[PDB]
Amino acid sequence: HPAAHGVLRLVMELSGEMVRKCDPHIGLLHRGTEKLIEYKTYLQALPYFDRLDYVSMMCNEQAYSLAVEKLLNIQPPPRAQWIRVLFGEITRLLNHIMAVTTHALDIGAMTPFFWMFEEREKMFEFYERVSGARMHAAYIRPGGVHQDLPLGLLDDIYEFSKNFSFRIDELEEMLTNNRIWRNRTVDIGVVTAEDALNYGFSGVMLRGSGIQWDLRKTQPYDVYDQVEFDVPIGSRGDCYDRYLCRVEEMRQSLRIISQCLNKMPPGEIKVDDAKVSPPKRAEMKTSMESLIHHFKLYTEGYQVPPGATYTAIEAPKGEFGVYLVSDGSSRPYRCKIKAPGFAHLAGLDKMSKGHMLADVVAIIGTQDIVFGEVDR
Amino acid sequence: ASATRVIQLLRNWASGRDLQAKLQLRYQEISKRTQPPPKLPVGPSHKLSNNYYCTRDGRREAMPPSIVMSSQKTEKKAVTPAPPIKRWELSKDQPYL
Amino acid sequence: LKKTTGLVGLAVCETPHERLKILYTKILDVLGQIPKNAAYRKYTEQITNEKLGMVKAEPDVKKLEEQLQGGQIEEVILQAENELSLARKMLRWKPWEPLVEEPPANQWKWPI
Amino acid sequence: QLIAVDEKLDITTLTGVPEEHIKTRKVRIFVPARNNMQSGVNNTKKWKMEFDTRERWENPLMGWSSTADPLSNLVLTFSTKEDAVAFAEKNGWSFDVEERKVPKPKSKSYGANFSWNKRTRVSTK
Amino acid sequence: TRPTIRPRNDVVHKQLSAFGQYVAEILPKYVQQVQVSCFNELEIFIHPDGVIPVLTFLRDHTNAQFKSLADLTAVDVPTRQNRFEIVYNLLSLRFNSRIRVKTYTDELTPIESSVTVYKAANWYEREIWDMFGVFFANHPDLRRILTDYGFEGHPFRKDFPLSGYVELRYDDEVKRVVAEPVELAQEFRKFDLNSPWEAFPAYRQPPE
Amino acid sequence: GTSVKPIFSRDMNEAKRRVRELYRAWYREVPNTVHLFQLDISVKQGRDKVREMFMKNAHVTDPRVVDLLVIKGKMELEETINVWKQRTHIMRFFHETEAPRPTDFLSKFYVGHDP
Amino acid sequence: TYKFVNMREPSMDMKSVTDRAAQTLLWTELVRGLGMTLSYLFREPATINYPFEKGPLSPRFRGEHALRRYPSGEERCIACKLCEAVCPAQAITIEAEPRADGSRRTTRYDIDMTKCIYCGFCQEACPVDAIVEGPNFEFSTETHEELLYNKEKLLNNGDKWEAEIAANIQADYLYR
Amino acid sequence: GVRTSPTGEKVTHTGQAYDDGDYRRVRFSDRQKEVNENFAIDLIAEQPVSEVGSRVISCDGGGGALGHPRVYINLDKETKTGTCGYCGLQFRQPHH
Amino acid sequence: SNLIEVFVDGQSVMVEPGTTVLQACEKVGMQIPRFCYHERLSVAGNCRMCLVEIEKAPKVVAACAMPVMKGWNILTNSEKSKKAREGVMEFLLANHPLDCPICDQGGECDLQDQSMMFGSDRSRFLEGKRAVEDKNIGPLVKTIMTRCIQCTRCIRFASEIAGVDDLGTTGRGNDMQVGTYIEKMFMSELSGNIIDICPVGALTSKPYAFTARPWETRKTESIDVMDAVG
Amino acid sequence: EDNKQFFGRHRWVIYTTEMNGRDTFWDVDGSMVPPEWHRWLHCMTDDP
Ligand SMILES: CCCCCCCC/C=C\CCCCCCCC(=O)O[C@H](COC(=O)CCCCCCC/C=C/CCCCCCCC)COP(=O)(O)OCCN
Ligand code: SF4
Ligand code: SF4
Ligand code: SF4
Ligand code: SF4
Ligand code: FES
Numbered sequence A: 001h002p003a004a005h006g007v008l009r010l011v012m013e014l015s016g017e018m019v020r021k022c023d024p025h026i027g028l029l030h031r032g033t034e035k036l037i038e039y040k041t042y043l044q045a046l047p048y049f050d051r052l053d054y055v056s057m058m059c060n061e062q063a064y065s066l067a068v069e070k071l072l073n074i075q076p077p078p079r080a081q082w083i084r085v086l087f088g089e090i091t092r093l094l095n096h097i098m099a100v101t102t103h104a105l106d107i108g109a110m111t112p113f114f115w116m117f118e119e120r121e122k123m124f125e126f127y128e129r130v131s132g133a134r135m136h137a138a139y140i141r142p143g144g145v146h147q148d149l150p151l152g153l154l155d156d157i158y159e160f161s162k163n164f165s166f167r168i169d170e171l172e173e174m175l176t177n178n179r180i181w182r183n184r185t186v187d188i189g190v191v192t193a194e195d196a197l198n199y200g201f202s203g204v205m206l207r208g209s210g211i212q213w214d215l216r217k218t219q220p221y222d223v224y225d226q227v228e229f230d231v232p233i234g235s236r237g238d239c240y241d242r243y244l245c246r247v248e249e250m251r252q253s254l255r256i257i258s259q260c261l262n263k264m265p266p267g268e269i270k271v272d273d274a275k276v277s278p279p280k281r282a283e284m285k286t287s288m289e290s291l292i293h294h295f296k297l298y299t300e301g302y303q304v305p306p307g308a309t310y311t312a313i314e315a316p317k318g319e320f321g322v323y324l325v326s327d328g329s330s331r332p333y334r335c336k337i338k339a340p341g342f343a344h345l346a347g348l349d350k351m352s353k354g355h356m357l358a359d360v361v362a363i364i365g366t367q368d369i370v371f372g373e374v375d376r
Numbered sequence B: 001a002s003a004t005r006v007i008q009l010l011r012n013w014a015s016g017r018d019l020q021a022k023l024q025l026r027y028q029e030i031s032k033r034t035q036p037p038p039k040l041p042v043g044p045s046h047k048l049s050n051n052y053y054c055t056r057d058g059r060r061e062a063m064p065p066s067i068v069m070s071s072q073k074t075e076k077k078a079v080t081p082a083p084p085i086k087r088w089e090l091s092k093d094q095p096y097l
Numbered sequence C: 001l002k003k004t005t006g007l008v009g010l011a012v013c014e015t016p017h018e019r020l021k022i023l024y025t026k027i028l029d030v031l032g033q034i035p036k037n038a039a040y041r042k043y044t045e046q047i048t049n050e051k052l053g054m055v056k057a058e059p060d061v062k063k064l065e066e067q068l069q070g071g072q073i074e075e076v077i078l079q080a081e082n083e084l085s086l087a088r089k090m091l092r093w094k095p096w097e098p099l100v101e102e103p104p105a106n107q108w109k110w111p112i
Numbered sequence D: 001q002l003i004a005v006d007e008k009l010d011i012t013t014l015t016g017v018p019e020e021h022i023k024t025r026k027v028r029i030f031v032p033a034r035n036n037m038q039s040g041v042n043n044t045k046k047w048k049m050e051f052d053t054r055e056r057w058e059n060p061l062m063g064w065s066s067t068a069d070p071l072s073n074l075v076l077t078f079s080t081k082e083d084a085v086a087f088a089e090k091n092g093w094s095f096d097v098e099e100r101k102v103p104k105p106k107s108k109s110y111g112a113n114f115s116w117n118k119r120t121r122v123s124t125k
Numbered sequence E: 001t002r003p004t005i006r007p008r009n010d011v012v013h014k015q016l017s018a019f020g021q022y023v024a025e026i027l028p029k030y031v032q033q034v035q036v037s038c039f040n041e042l043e044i045f046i047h048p049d050g051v052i053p054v055l056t057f058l059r060d061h062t063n064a065q066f067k068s069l070a071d072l073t074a075v076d077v078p079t080r081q082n083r084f085e086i087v088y089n090l091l092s093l094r095f096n097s098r099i100r101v102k103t104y105t106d107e108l109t110p111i112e113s114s115v116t117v118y119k120a121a122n123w124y125e126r127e128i129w130d131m132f133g134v135f136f137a138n139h140p141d142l143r144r145i146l147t148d149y150g151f152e153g154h155p156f157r158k159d160f161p162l163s164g165y166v167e168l169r170y171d172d173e174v175k176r177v178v179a180e181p182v183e184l185a186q187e188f189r190k191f192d193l194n195s196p197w198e199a200f201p202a203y204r205q206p207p208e
Numbered sequence F: 001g002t003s004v005k006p007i008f009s010r011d012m013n014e015a016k017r018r019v020r021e022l023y024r025a026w027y028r029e030v031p032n033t034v035h036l037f038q039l040d041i042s043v044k045q046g047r048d049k050v051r052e053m054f055m056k057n058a059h060v061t062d063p064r065v066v067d068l069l070v071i072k073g074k075m076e077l078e079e080t081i082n083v084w085k086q087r088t089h090i091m092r093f094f095h096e097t098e099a100p101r102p103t104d105f106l107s108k109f110y111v112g113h114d115p
Numbered sequence G: 001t002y003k004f005v006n007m008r009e010p011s012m013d014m015k016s017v018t019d020r021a022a023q024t025l026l027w028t029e030l031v032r033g034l035g036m037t038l039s040y041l042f043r044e045p046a047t048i049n050y051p052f053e054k055g056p057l058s059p060r061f062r063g064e065h066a067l068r069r070y071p072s073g074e075e076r077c078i079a080c081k082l083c084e085a086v087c088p089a090q091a092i093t094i095e096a097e098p099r100a101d102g103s104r105r106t107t108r109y110d111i112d113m114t115k116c117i118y119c120g121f122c123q124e125a126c127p128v129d130a131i132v133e134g135p136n137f138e139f140s141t142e143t144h145e146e147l148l149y150n151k152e153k154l155l156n157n158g159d160k161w162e163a164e165i166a167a168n169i170q171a172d173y174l175y176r
Numbered sequence H: 001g002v003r004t005s006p007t008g009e010k011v012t013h014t015g016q017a018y019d020d021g022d023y024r025r026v027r028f029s030d031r032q033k034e035v036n037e038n039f040a041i042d043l044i045a046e047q048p049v050s051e052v053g054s055r056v057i058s059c060d061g062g063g064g065a066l067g068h069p070r071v072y073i074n075l076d077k078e079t080k081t082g083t084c085g086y087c088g089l090q091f092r093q094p095h096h
Numbered sequence I: 001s002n003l004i005e006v007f008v009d010g011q012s013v014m015v016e017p018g019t020t021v022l023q024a025c026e027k028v029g030m031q032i033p034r035f036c037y038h039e040r041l042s043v044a045g046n047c048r049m050c051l052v053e054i055e056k057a058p059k060v061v062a063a064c065a066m067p068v069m070k071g072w073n074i075l076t077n078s079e080k081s082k083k084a085r086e087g088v089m090e091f092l093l094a095n096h097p098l099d100c101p102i103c104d105q106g107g108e109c110d111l112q113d114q115s116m117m118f119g120s121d122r123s124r125f126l127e128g129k130r131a132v133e134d135k136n137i138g139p140l141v142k143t144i145m146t147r148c149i150q151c152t153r154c155i156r157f158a159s160e161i162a163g164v165d166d167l168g169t170t171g172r173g174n175d176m177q178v179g180t181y182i183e184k185m186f187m188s189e190l191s192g193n194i195i196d197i198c199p200v201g202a203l204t205s206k207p208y209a210f211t212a213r214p215w216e217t218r219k220t221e222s223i224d225v226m227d228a229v230g
Numbered sequence J: 001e002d003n004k005q006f007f008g009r010h011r012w013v014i015y016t017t018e019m020n021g022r023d024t025f026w027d028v029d030g031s032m033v034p035p036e037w038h039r040w041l042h043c044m045t046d047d048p
């Protein structure tokens, strides 16, 4: 179904077009990722986090890298952290464009999708220049980043960033004040603050209901404590408030990107510790220790001291977490992945009480669901 | 750019903005596809002296978790996990959209 | 006086001082039925007594909110009701008793 | 409330393993031998459970190594031999256990290399 | 020790240790152990019978207020007599903190469903049941969530094989999709990577 | 002793009662299943298969294991009734595309190395 | 630090009321949306004339795999098997033996292109720059078997794409 | 160094050609067999041996960081030549 | 009885008189890094990788040769021990060839593993490396002498276990080399064992050359039938 | 090329009508570009 947003089988009980019951059946994209991770080394498991939520690739890489770095007791260098925050905000732009335009497309407003996907294409080009891939980059690694930025990337990121606000403005002209859009979005899928907290909601699904919580502000990571931005807050807990929150979050991401462009420091890009991060190729081809460490890091991988962590980030879809258990070897013993879409879809049935079919379509759109992270 | 001025005027009037100022197609202001070679600075551990690895070994400073209250083994003011959060401030930049 | 608590589903409270006093008195009454040497009773009594004193000493709602550190007195009321419900549950559960069972010797041993 | 069940533990009907892979399988419970190419002993600390080797053949295309054995890769790690035996028993697998082999304590003496009348004296150094 | 080593935070460590002591004193009936990890994460190891009380306390206490259940999962450790380790992750917005609660069970012992305490658990407990086979008592609607209809066994269990026992293919004679015993063109190649030399002296176990 | 906690039944009698109830429910469901899924089997075949699946686990003597088996059978029944299952899932019980594997020594010796 | 997105109150003056009545009855914001679409109608489309025009790429782009040689024509690969060890998809299969002149060379080098995730970890792991992901991306096949590459196919890819692969490596190796 | 088998099939650098009674040759009928024509063993056998006036020489395959890891080759044996274990190039001291 | 009490990292243990520091550390389950010590060969003490600090002693001792003294407190993880291991690994790797991708010892190398575990992660050696000519000791044991770390395990095994005095060291200092000095085939029914005990890729199996890597192999513990020893 | 076109439309190829053996008057595809012109055409470099 076009409105399904992936391989989702939603079983509904209907009286006329009124929805009496929603039963989301998932698992049509369960690939058994966590067992597979248990069969890999820590570097081999990284590309799985690209494919969990395929619209926020580097954010998932960052969450996993933070978990592994916390377990390794090491620290990424400052330039790497600035690169991580910059590309996390670019990724948030990508995700919010995808969410807003696919929501509008379900509702029926097909045009803004085509306007915004050219911008998405320009950001895919940024991804590709840095890593050689437009989507599953695998750029963020448990030691920093894989490669330094190419010699003219910052200028192009600046050129893109100084035009994007007008595209957001055109989107808002299309949608924000349209009476049809407001009729399809205002007072649809209203959730109270206490219900949102109890059901496990996070991100926009909290902020639309007035709860003042953003993980970048409350539990900052990387260099998020050094950037300035506002957190959008809703008033009514409906789809209109969440749409406004996402648009304003796009604007605040532009703000953060400008700050990151003007504040990128020099230095190395991965932790200067060759028992965790691979050495440079010239060193690998000149020095005995560098060659030994390259060999061992690419065959066996680094060992992680025993212990378990729960690391969470403010991914564009909500709180994204990893419960990572190390038994002391170079392979993870356990990796549980916490995806906000799981709880949001588990609450979809609650949010659709007393609504019609089209309202349920709008609610699925407003929950910002990608089933790679839901099923794993 | 290529478009005749009258079409530019019609575009500006319909959109309500000066379209030419912020064109969405990259005409010539982007970086060249060929660049000079880089040099890339070395890390802090690239010293030739006073660089013993045992003084910069983060993996070996991890320890097993500290045990509080094993079961197998004064007023006492009540405590909390952390101090209460401070209330947020209302965005001196733009408080209301 | 104040409109829009700001949280969806949380109504604005008229007369919040009286509600808070009633709730804290009920909480202390319930705690009075717990054994005096139980840690839950003394801790909850201490915090409840401080909050009740703060409510009694501050007639102003915004100044009281800033003193209580509880985030918008309607939330303080909700938390008081939550604590009262928990107090009744703890009375029924009696978690101050000695540990029910001791786990196997290698149950929490990690790694392996 | 406790009901005082009297029988041996048995979970085969709940695991979902096909009966062929429950009755005809033999597991080995053992401490793996030290790899003779190295001196480290860190891989000889825990007990291992592993299944019997089944048929592997050649793929007609590409000549890869094909198997039809779903348990050909499964290795379990245990703290003690008793835990491994209990796991195998409750899962219904026939097992063979091997007692742990440790290197015997050896009497070393550097000075013996230079014995006045003994055969131990080194001809070279 | 400066540039490449993760910095410490002793203030948060002290606060979490004190709060763990607080929780242990308030609920001696269930709390078996309290730990503060080196990177400031607080874990409370309890008895299974105290799943519902502990969590309820941690959700409703004025000094606790962990009103959000971030995650709930299981870990399989076959060497333990109680195979499965149930892990609850809770977040407090009022105090901007996180807590972990751990308990244990085996194959035949149910755990109390905590849907009443947290609505979020519903799908988490269904997922634990599906992947590990841990039954949850008094669950509103307990059934498989991730696996295929009619799928036998629990995939996340350590004993279960990585590629399972059956595969699917379309068969033209019966004109439908059929399930058959797994055959692999190329077998997954098992690697032995563990180094025979010890990496971390701080975690060395006694020689028994 | 042995200090175990039950799921539903305290002894084998209650577990057998639950088994009988689940068997009744499956027996009643079989004709509706044959009608709804448009299966080419008879109702007799379906009830025979239900009996065979029940008898696969006749050797169980633990009330907790029996309780879990009844829970799984109830899960499967709920799944079948609501049509979550498709015709392929129902027909997976009959193994219609699986060639019969022999059990005597000589045929096994002829085909390959597996016992 | 937060802002409100929907906490604004409407003016109640007669002028404001008449403007809102005009908006309701004469559909002003709908004409605004029509104007936006009409504006986009007169812009130049962002479409490119494929296959004549191509999308921009980078020297770091990961494409079809290739096995390279030294300038002498000798293969670079020495069968260290690091690419096979690092591959997260287990897409690489390697068999090696001493060559007739005693050289350490492969006798089997397969990449299953329908297992591969195109991560580029193998070219990072290779210590002699033997395995690369070349720039090509237009290699769709009509059968599944054509995507199971052996050593001959990969050596042919290297021979076919060396001119561009060397120029791509020269432009990026100082970042590696 | 290509050469055909008695069946007309090209023999690869590896040396594998399907046998006369091997059915697998049917996979090439109506199609072709992929064979790389530049045999590395033959191409490296054409390179001239480098003469150097030192007992120990160094090889990195050329190109600096674009070659292989740098190795040192002893050249004391005069009955043979020093061969790089990475690139296959040969070195000798001026003899006779 | 005759047992004496010594401490490994402040922990008491009872050992027989004449027990070396290495064996006492092994009693508590700690393995001292080694290259030249083999518990079935005579003690050499040459590699110097086993140097450890004894409490209240300024000089590190060689754990593989030094007998424990009553009341001693070994300190296997002190700064002095770690710096000793780092320096000895540095001297070992100074002249070692960059041969890991072509070395059969690759994933099974004690030198590699102990470099990863106890050594530094970098080189500050800026000179040229030494290179030595290869020896031919028969069709079973491949020889790549540049890789030799001069442990002398092969010499002690051949002299003491095999009963042959064909192996030795010629020259001295940096130029000291392990070999036979003449064209000789080290042929004996126990010869192949010098491949196992050699910690580096200097001595490798000629039949096994280049065919496999250790991480891909599956291990089946079995018995030999080539004779009646089993 | 035409540098006044926007990025993407500033470089293009008019394919040959006769490749190795097949008629390519209508049947063209991107795989007919040789690697050096492939590098120039996909804007991996500025130098033809
Ligand atoms: C002297 C005596 C004179 C007599 C009086 C004459 C003056 C009359 C003044 C008033 C005339 C108003 C006529 C308009 C009728 C509809 C107005 C209206 O209220 O409709 C809107 C909604 O109508 C719409 O907006 C339509 C939505 C769909 C729009 C589709 C495309 C938009 C139209 C494009 C241009 C139209 C061109 C039409 C002319 C074509 C030429 C034949 C109401 O809906 P809501 O805003 O949701 O509020 C009501 C409930 N609270
Ligand atoms: S690109 Fe990645 S998946 Fe593909 S062969 Fe290389 S390492 Fe394996
Ligand atoms: S391609 Fe490179 S990494 Fe792979 S086996 Fe050959 S030399 Fe080793
Ligand atoms: S012996 Fe070990 S360190 Fe030396 S080249 Fe071989 S693998 Fe590398
Ligand atoms: S060849 Fe091996 S065993 Fe012999 S001295 Fe050298 S490193 Fe030691
Ligand atoms: S092991 Fe003691 S000196 Fe070598």
Ligand SMILES: [Mg+2]
Pocket (backbone or CB within 6 Å): I105, I194, I195, I196, I197, I198, I199, I200, I201, I202, I203, I204
């Ligand atoms: Mg050896």
Ligand SMILES: [Zn+2]
Pocket (backbone or CB within 6 Å): H059, H060, H061, H068, H084, H085, H086, H087, H088, H089
């Ligand atoms: Zn070379």
